[PDB]
Every structure is written in structure tokens, then in C-alpha cells.
């Protein structure tokens, strides 16, 4: 009932619209040269991380 | 804060009273309606001799007319 | 009985000599069968006195 | 008379009262008269010269983020040289007025320096303050040119004034260098200009240019400053157009008044076939020349 | 030849430009 | 003291005086000179020592001040000693 | 109606201005061309070029 | 305390200048601008919009 | 305290006044709207009766 | 600028709509909205109130 | 002139003559001379473009 109440109020729609408004500054992340190596140093999995 | 602005409505300072007639007068309501909707042109009427005035500053008695900060 | 908002400046145009028995208008308008129900309890027991 | 009747057009959803009252008139003693104009959003402000009534933070945001208006006007004038725009006299004229804004103070102080025989010691802070306060209130519009000049030539200077003068001056008319140095000091102490050397330059050049005229230092008190009837700006005294003094030269066609649109004319109000007899447009060229 | 395309252009919902 | 836990649905307005006037389209009297011309008898503010058996002036000033302090909520959260 | 598509979402332009600078407002014997820009045309071609 | 709420209708999209002439007279309103498209109407009264 | 404010009162602060006791003016929406417009027309310090 | 049109289209109403929160809650049921024409004359002001 | 210093003309007169000369040959003077000439249209399309 409650999540449909925020629907009939339109609060989920405000949530979604705020999503794309916030999207107006988020730079594209740099994903590293060897994107698997990027994520690997990210999770710390290669030797020494 | 200076010396009060002292108007009168009557014959004298000692007879008449400090108080202009509030906006509710029969003569003032057209003028107040205009000064509301066309707030940037200058409107004829008696709406000025009232207490309610267009300005942020209303002609309610003991206004200190020489105040540094009104 | 007219039904525009209760102004608080009636005590000053009506000569109901029970007016200035009290101070504020919604207590000078109050009826007496009611005003008997007004109980004497010291001040910080009025939920605004507290 | 075969009298004509015109039923008054009443306002509608589509055809509003303003148009139906100015675009239309029911009294046909004005029919087919001519085209009137008026100004709206920015044309009205451009013509009426109504300064924005200031405020606190918001007008000061719009007003502080102004920057060098004279330059930005120039930017906007030249940018008409880019591909997608044309160099426009309206841009040039906004530049011309953004540069000639301080015409009043300049024409005044030039009159003061060069038309006031024996102006005390202007370098003495007394008369210098008379000068500063007057020119300060000549800009900022609080005083007129004429009344301010009378305030200048009437301010209090020194007792026994003629007697001190007839000791220092033969014919009474002193050296003008103290005067013009005082006036340049005036407009450089009061930030009359954003770019400082401009004050001095105009103060100097207007004087230099007048130095060539016959009676180059007398001014008929009426035309001298503002009044009801004035002189055309080419003929003003310390003005910027006085050097722009020239005139036009016309060889009209056998058919020159007819073709009033045919040339490479800029159209603000474009013709439409209801007034346009056979006109084609300002871009068409019936007689083209071959060229790479 | 986009790297890690099988997670980025194919399986990353927002094409890798949108941050959820 | 003398408490009874009553209730109240319609308070007045704030007696700031500057409550909008009920707007009207036309006037029942289309004569404006009548507001400019209206004389009255004089309001002699003091007759002799202005003494009156009821305290007719101080009492009314106190009864206006009382309710205006009420409405202004005693008028001190605005500023009293911000200085 | 079929005349209601011919409605409108603003308020109109209000004819509250004077004639813009150098507009051809008819004096006595000014041969008036309402169309030509009053400034941008007489601005010389030595400057502006025939564009 | 005394203000009005109105919902009215003239016409709304992007514009600079407006020439108007019902067959008698032609008044123009201006906002200076270089270039545009120039839409003409004749539905009752000749209007031209730039 | 109060009496010096009754002379500097404004038809702008009718909202803030009724806010003091959290009253609700009859036209609360028409007020909030215009009072917001007027309070826009001047600096946030130029319209706060607290100063 | 006294904004003025370049076109008109009878597009459907969902395109430029007051969003699901900026409008009141469900109006198919609780608030019947009808834009009817006033019988009294209106000079300025829409005919379909 | 700078090593010469403040002078003995009564009102620093020749110093002011020299200083009114000093800033007469600055760039700022040719800058403003240009701005003034621009206000007079001694130029052409090529000038505008440059």
C-alpha cells in the first residue's frame, strides 16, 4: 500500500527524475588501460595489492 | 531612532487622531485592489490617504521618519 | 449571531460589564457554566506554563 | 454619401484587445494612413534609456558580473564579422554609445577648463573640491550641465577676487594648464572611466580640436550646454561627432526612388507579396558574373 | 574494439556512461 | 491557575491591522469627495485632568496591549538581546 | 470549435513603447520606407560590405 | 494580504519582433535581433512574427 | 519590544507574523505567492523584520 | 521577451504534462477535471476555463 | 626629466607640461586614439575582420 501510495503521489517519479538531473555532472569513470588489470588492482587481487 | 512622523486626521494636532483610516474603508478598496494588481503603475485614488500603502512602509503612527535603518 | 472571524476587539464596543472581569477576549466571551469548570491549579501545570 | 459603416471589432480569444484596438480602428478617417511603430522587450529599454532599478544581491549579481561593458560591446560588434553574422550598425551604435556614455562630464569639464577666464587656483583644493563635487554631480545626473557650470563659476573662491586677479593677470585670462590638469585629475580620481587614460585623452583631444575654430573659446550661452533647443551633434562644441563632420553625395537613378529595396539593403522588416510588387529579395542577382 | 565489451556494452546496463 | 483544558478552532486573524480588505467590484456610493469632505465634532482629548471614574483610557490601552502581546507571542523570539 | 486550435498560451505583446531609434515615424515630407533597417542600411558599405 | 490569481491566454513560443496590421493601420513592437524565421498569419488580422 | 515594530510592520511580513503563533491566514496560498514575490524584489536582509 | 509561437500541434497530453507529483493525486477518480467554456463573456482570459 | 625633479615654476608648471607629454606617447594614448578613431569610422571591412 505504501509504495503504491508514493506512486499515486508521484514520489518514485521524483526519485527517477532526480536521477537524471544528478547525472548532469558525473564524469565517465576512467577504466584503466587493461580493464581487467584495472579491476584487478581494484579488488587488490594481483600479487602485492 | 529619531523623532516620530506625526500626521493627524482631523482639524488640529490636538483634536484629530494619530490614525489614518485603515484599508477597509469603502473608498479605499478599489484603490487597494488596483495597487495590488497593477503594482508598478501609479494609481489615482484615495488609497494613499489610507494606512495601507504600496510601499513596504505603512503609514501607521509613530513612524520614525529620520531613522537610520527603517 | 454573525459568523465572520472572531475579532479580539469586541470588548471595546460592547458594554457587557462582564467583559473586563477578565483580560483576554476568548475568556471574556466564555460562558459562566464553563468558567466554573476552570480549576485552580498552580502555574507550571498549565501546559504552557510548564 | 454611400456612407461607409464599420462595425467595431470586439475582442476575441484569438484577436486580443490591444491588437484589435491599435492594428484596427473602426473610424475610417485614418484608413490607409501609414505604418506606426513601438518598442517592446528590449527596444523599449534601448530607446527609453530607463536604467534598471537596482536592488541588493540580485541586481548586484547582474551588475557585478558585468565586466568591461565597453569591451563586451566591442566584442559584440566585431563578432558580426564571423561567418554566421553580419556587421551591423546597431551593434556599432551600441558600441558608440557605450563609449560615448561619458559625454556630459567630458563636455562640461572641457567647458570649465577652457571657457572660464581666471578660474581661481583650480589646483588649490578649494576650487578643486568645487570642481570634483560639481562634475561628480554632472555625471550621476543630479545636476544639469548649465546649472553646474554656473555653480562652478559662482562658487566661493577668495575675497577681493578682482583685486587679487588684476595683480596676476593683464587681460584676466589665466593659463589653462592648471585647469586641464585639474580636470584630468578630477576624472581620474572620480572613476568616471573604467580605462583611465581615456579620461585624459578625450579631455585633451576635444580641446585640441576646438583650438582650431574661430572664436574657439566663446560659446553662445544658450547652445553652449543643454537647453530646450540645441545644435546637431556634429555641431556640438566638445563633442565626438564634430570631427565626424561631413555630408552625403547622391546620384539617383532615372528610377531611384522606386527601387528603394532592390539593392543589397539590410531588411529589418522583410517585404511580403502584399506590399511587394515584383521585388525578389536582397540576395538575388539577375546579372551574375562567372568566378571561381 | 571496445575492451571488456561483454560486461560494458553488452551487460553494463547504462552503456558505461551512466553511474547508478 | 484557574485552568480548564478548553479548545479553540477559529482564532481571529493576526490583528496586525493589515488584513486585506474584502474586495468589491463597484461602490455603493460612487462619490469620492465624501471621504475628503467629512468633518466631525472635535475630539477634545482632555477636559479637566482627564479624570474618569472607570479608568477609561489606561484600561483600554491595557486591554489592547494584552491581546496584542498574546498575538505577538509576547514579541521576543524576534529579537530581544541579539545586541 | 474548429476555431479553438487558434488559441494561445501567453499574454500578448503590449503596445507600451515609443518608436525605436530612427524608426521612420512620419514627419511631413519624409518619403517613408517602413522596411529597410534605419541604421544597418545607412551604415556605409566601405565598412559593412555588400553582404 | 490582497492579491489575485489569473490564468489568461495570448500565444506562447519563441519570438523577437511583431508587426501587426489589420487593413487600416500597422503598429510594430520590437526586440532587436539579427535573424530568425518569419511567420505570417492572416487568420483575421495580418500579423507577422519574427 | 513590540511597539517599535508596529511602525515598521509591512504587508510583506503578514506571513512571518502569523508564523509566530503558527496561525494560518485565510488566503495562505495567495499570500505565500505574493509575499514570496515581494520578498524576492528585495534583499533577504531588506525584508526580515528580525533586523 | 514576449514569447510568441512558431507552430501549433494537437499532440497528446502526456508529452508536456505536470508531473505525477506536481499534480494532485489520482484525478480519474477523486477530482473530475473538465475544461468547459464560460457562459459569461470573457474578453481577456481563455474561453475554455 | 626624472633626474631633474620638481621644478621652480610656481605651480609645478613645466613638470605638468612634461607629464602631460609623458602620457601622451604611451600605448594607452594610442589605444584611446584608436578607440576614438573607431568612433569615427576611418576604416573598412578588412579592418573589422582583422
In contact, D182 and D122? CB cutoff 8 Å: yes
> H19-46: buried (b, 16+ CB within 10 Å) or exposed (e) per residue?
bbbbebbbbbbbbbbeeeeeeeeeebbb
Query: CA K18 → CA H21, K7, K12, K24, distances in Å?
Result: 65, 11, 10, 10
Which grid cell sits at E4? Answer: 571488456
Chains G and E touch (3+ CB pairs under 8 A): no
Identify the experimental approach.
cryo-EM
Which residues fall within 8 angstroms of residue D158, CB to CB, at 6 or more apart? D120, D164
Sign, Cα dihedral of F61, F64, F69, F72: negative
State whether D33 and H25 contact (CB < 8 Å): yes
In contact, D230 and D223? CB cutoff 8 Å: yes
d(CA D198, CA F81) in angstroms, rounded, equals 53
Q: Are strands H25-29 and B63-64 parallel, antiparallel or unpaired?
A: unpaired
Chains I and G touch (3+ CB pairs under 8 A): no
In contact, D146 and D226? CB cutoff 8 Å: yes
Q: Are strands H46-49 and B63-64 parallel, antiparallel or unpaired?
A: unpaired
Q: Which of these, I31, B16, G11, J16, lies nearest to D40 by C-alpha position?
A: G11
A positions 1-49 inside 8 Å of E (CB): 23, 26, 28-29, 31, 34-36
Query: CA D282 → CA D266, E17, H28, distances in Å?
Result: 8, 48, 22
Residue that the C-alpha cell 594607452 belongs to: K28
Which residues fall within 8 angstroms of residue D272, CB to CB, at 6 or more apart? H40, H48
DSSP letter (8 states) at residue B23: T
> B24-41: buried (b, 16+ CB within 10 Å) or exposed (e) per residue?
bbebbbbbbbbbbeeeee
Which grid cell sits at F67? Answer: 491581546
State whether H3 and B23 contact (CB < 8 Å): no
Measured in whole angstroms, how far is the alpha carbon of residue C1 from the centre of its chain? 18
In contact, H34 and F53? CB cutoff 8 Å: no
d(CA D80, CA D188) in angstroms, rounded, equals 33
Sign, Cα dihedral of D241, D244, D247, D253: negative
Other C-beta atoms closer than 10 Å to the C-beta of D17 total: 14
Tell me the nearest-neighbour CA distance from B22 into chain I, angstroms.
13
Q: Are strands B63-64 and H18-22 parallel, antiparallel or unpaired?
A: unpaired
Which grid cell sits at G32? Answer: 517613408
Query: CA D63 → CA D49, D192, D241, distances in Å?
Result: 16, 17, 30
Which grid cell sits at D256? Answer: 531611384
Which residues fall within 8 angstroms of residue D42, CB to CB, at 6 or more apart? H30, H31, H32, J1
Other C-beta atoms closer than 10 Å to the C-beta of B42 total: 7
Determine phi and psi for B5, rounding to 5 degrees: -85, 125
d(CA B51, CA B59) in angstroms, rounded, equals 5
Q: Which of these, D183, D212, D176, D219, lies nearest to D200 by C-alpha position?
A: D183
Residue that the C-alpha cell 572611466 belongs to: D193
In contact, D267 and G39? CB cutoff 8 Å: no
Q: What subunits touch chain H, counting only 3 or more CB pairs under 8 A?
A: B, D, F, G, I, J
Q: What subunits touch chain C, counting only 3 or more CB pairs under 8 A?
A: F
E strand spans, chain D: none
Q: Which of these, B33, B15, B16, lies nearest to B24 by C-alpha position?
A: B33
Determine phi and psi for C39, rounding to 5 degrees: -100, 140
Q: What is the DSSP string of D54-115?
A: --SHHHHHHHHTT--HHHHHHHHHHGGGSTT----HHHHHHHHHHHSSTTHHHHHHHHHHHH
In a 3-state reduction of DSSP, which class is residue A18? helix
In contact, D200 and K23? CB cutoff 8 Å: yes
Residue D144 CB-half CA count within 13 A? 8
Instruction: List the resolution, Å.
Output: 3.5
Q: Which of these, J26, B68, G36, lies nearest to D265 by C-alpha position?
A: G36
Amino acid at each position: 500500500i505504501e509504495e503504491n501510495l508514493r506512486i499515486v503521489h508521484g514520489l518514485r517519479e521524483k526519485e527517477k527524475y532526480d536521477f537524471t538531473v544528478l547525472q548532469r555532472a558525473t564524469r565517465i569513470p576512467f577504466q584503466g588501460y587493461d580493464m581487467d588489470r584495472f579491476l584487478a588492482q581494484q579488488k587488490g587481487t594481483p600479487y602485492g595489492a | 531612532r529619531g523623532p516620530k512622523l506625526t500626521e493627524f486626521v482631523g482639524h488640529n494636532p490636538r483634536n484629530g487622531t494619530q490614525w489614518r483610516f485603515s484599508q477597509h474603508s469603502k473608498y479605499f478598496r478599489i484603490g487597494v485592489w488596483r495597487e495590488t494588481i497593477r503594482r508598478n503603475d501609479m494609481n489615482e485614488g484615495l488609497h494613499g490617504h489610507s494606512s495601507w500603502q504600496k510601499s513596504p512602509q505603512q503609514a501607521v503612527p509613530e513612524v520614525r521618519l529620520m531613522a537610520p535603518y527603517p | 449571531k454573525s459568523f465572520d472571524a472572531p475579532q479580539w476587539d469586541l470588548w471595546q464596543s460592547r458594554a457587557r460589564s462582564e467583559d473586563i472581569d477578565e483580560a483576554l477576549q476568548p475568556f471574556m466571551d466564555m460562558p459562566q457554566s464553563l468558567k466554573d469548570r476552570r480549576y485552580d491549579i498552580p502555574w507550571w501545570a498549565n501546559p504552557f506554563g510548564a | 454619401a454611400k456612407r461607409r459603416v464599420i462595425v467595431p471589432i470586439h475582442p476575441t480569444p484569438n484577436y486580443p484587445a490591444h491588437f484589435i484596438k491599435a492594428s484596427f480602428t473602426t473610424d475610417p478617417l485614418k484608413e490607409k494612413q501609414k505604418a506606426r511603430f513601438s518598442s517592446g522587450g528590449e527596444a523599449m529599454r534601448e530607446v527609453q534609456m530607463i536604467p534598471k532599478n537596482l536592488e541588493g544581491e540580485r541586481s548586484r549579481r547582474e551588475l557585478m558580473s558585468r565586466g568591461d561593458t565597453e569591451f563586451e560591446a566591442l566584442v559584440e560588434f566585431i563578432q558580426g564579422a564571423s561567418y554566421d553574422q553580419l556587421i551591423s550598425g546597431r551593434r556599432f551604435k551600441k558600441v558608440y554609445d557605450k563609449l560615448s556614455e561619458n559625454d556630459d562630464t567630458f563636455v562640461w569639464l572641457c567647458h570649465t577648463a577652457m571657457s572660464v577666464l581666471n578660474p581661481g587656483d583650480v589646483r588649490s583644493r578649494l576650487v578643486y573640491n568645487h570642481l570634483r563635487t560639481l562634475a561628480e554631480a554632472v555625471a550621476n545626473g543630479e545636476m544639469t550641465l548649465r546649472t553646474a557650470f554656473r555653480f562652478y563659476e559662482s562658487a566661493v573662491r577668495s575675497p577681493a577676487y578682482r583685486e587679487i586677479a588684476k595683480r596676476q593677470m593683464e587681460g584676466g585670462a589665466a593659463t589653462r594648464l592648471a585647469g586641464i590638469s585639474a580636470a584630468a585629475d578630477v576624472m581620474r580620481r572620480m572613476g568616471l572611466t573604467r580605462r583611465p587614460m581615456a579620461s585624459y585623452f578625450e579631455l585633451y583631444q576635444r580641446i585640441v580640436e576646438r583650438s582650431e575654430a574661430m572664436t574657439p573659446w566663446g560659446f553662445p550661452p544658450l547652445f553652449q550646454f543643454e537647453e530646450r533647443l540645441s545644435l546637431e551633434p556634429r555641431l556640438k562644441f566638445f563633442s565626438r561627432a564634430s570631427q565626424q563632420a561631413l555630408e552625403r553625395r547622391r546620384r539617383g537613378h532615372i528610377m531611384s526612388a522606386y527601387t528603394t529595396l532592390q539593392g543589397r539593403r539590410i531588411f529589418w522588416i522583410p517585404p511580403t507579396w502584399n506590399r511587394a510588387g515584383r521585388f525578389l529579395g536582397p540576395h538575388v542577382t539577375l546579372y551574375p558574373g562567372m568566378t571561381p | 574494439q571496445l575492451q571488456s565489451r561483454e560486461r560494458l556494452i553488452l551487460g553494463t546496463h547504462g552503456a558505461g556512461v551512466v553511474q547508478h | 491557575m484557574k485552568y480548564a483544558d478548553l479548545e479553540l478552532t477559529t482564532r481571529g486573524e493576526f490583528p496586525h491591522g493589515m488584513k486585506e480588505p474584502g474586495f468589491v467590484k463597484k461602490l455603493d456610493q460612487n462619490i469620492p469627495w465624501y471621504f475628503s469632505t467629512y468633518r466631525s465634532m472635535y475630539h477634545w482629548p482632555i477636559t479637566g485632568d482627564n479624570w474618569s471614574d472607570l479608568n477609561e483610557a489606561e484600561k483600554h490601552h491595557d486591554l489592547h496591549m494584552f491581546y496584542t502581546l498574546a498575538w505577538w507571542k509576547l514579541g521576543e523570539g524576534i529579537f530581544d538581546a541579539n545586541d | 470549435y474548429y476555431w479553438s486550435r487558434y488559441r494561445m498560451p501567453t499574454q500578448m505583446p503590449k503596445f507600451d513603447g515609443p518608436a525605436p531609434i530612427a524608426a521612420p515615424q512620419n514627419m511631413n515630407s519624409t518619403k517613408t520606407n517602413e522596411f529597410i533597417d534605419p541604421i544597418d542600411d545607412k551604415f556605409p558599405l566601405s565598412i559593412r560590405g555588400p553582404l | 494580504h490582497l492579491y489575485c490569481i489569473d490564468n489568461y491566454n495570448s500565444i506562447y513560443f519563441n519570438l523577437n519582433g511583431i508587426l501587426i496590421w489589420l487593413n487600416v493601420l500597422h503598429i510594430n513592437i520590437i526586440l532587436i535581433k539579427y535573424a530568425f524565421l518569419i511567420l505570417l498569419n492572416n487568420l483575421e488580422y495580418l500579423i507577422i512574427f519574427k | 519590544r513590540i511597539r517599535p515594530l508596529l511602525a515598521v510592520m509591512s504587508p510583506v511580513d503578514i506571513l512571518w507574523l502569523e508564523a509566530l503563533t503558527q496561525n494560518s491566514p485565510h488566503n495562505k496560498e495567495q499570500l505565500q505567492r505574493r509575499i514570496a514575490f515581494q520578498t524576492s524584489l528585495g534583499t533577504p536582509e531588506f525584508f526580515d523584520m528580525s533586523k | 521577451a514576449t514569447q510568441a509561437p512558431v507552430a501549433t500541434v494537437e499532440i497528446p497530453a502526456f508529452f508536456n504534462e505536470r508531473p505525477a507529483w506536481e499534480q494532485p493525486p489520482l484525478e480519474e477518480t477523486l477530482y473530475v477535471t473538465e475544461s468547459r467554456e464560460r457562459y459569461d463573456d470573457v474578453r481577456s482570459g481563455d474561453i475554455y476555463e | 626629466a626624472e633626474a631633474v625633479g620638481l621644478d621652480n615654476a610656481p605651480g609645478h608648471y613645466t613638470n605638468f607640461l612634461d607629464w602631460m607629454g609623458r602620457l601622451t606617447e604611451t600605448r594607452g594614448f594610442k589605444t584611446e586614439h584608436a578607440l576614438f578613431q573607431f568612433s569615427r569610422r576611418k576604416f573598412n571591412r578588412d579592418d573589422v575582420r582583422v
